């Protein structure tokens, strides 16, 4: 019965101050190519300017 992979979403908790971003950020991480480190600073540096 081929398992099926989805997204949990941290609604198990039921919080306020804990639980901030939704699963949208997820799909967003999934789109971007794996960064290295200078590359994270490069992308971050570009945003600073």
């Amino acid at each position: 019965r081929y398992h099926e992979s989805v997204l949990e979403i941290a609604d198990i908790f039921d919080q306020a101050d804990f639980i901030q971003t939704s699963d949208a950020v997820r799909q967003l991480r999934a789109l971007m190519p794996t960064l290295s480190t200078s590359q994270i600073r490069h992308a971050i540096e570009r945003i600073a300017q």
Partner: protein, 50 residues
């Protein structure tokens, strides 16, 4: 024979520490799948022949 002695002598010297010369971090987007499977993260702009 003296040739072997010299190619052995250069190996007894040498010396030669290595520093990281040139970095290239590609985009996984930009690489073919195989050349991405071999490649780890960064490479040197002069690769060799293998």
């Amino acid at each position: 024979v003296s040739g072997l002695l010299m190619v052995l002598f250069k190996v007894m010297t040498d010396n030669r520490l290595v520093i990281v010369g040139e970095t290239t971090t590609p985009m996984s987007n930009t690489l073919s799948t195989v050349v991405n499977n071999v490649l780890r993260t960064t490479y040197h702009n002069n690769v060799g022949v293998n």
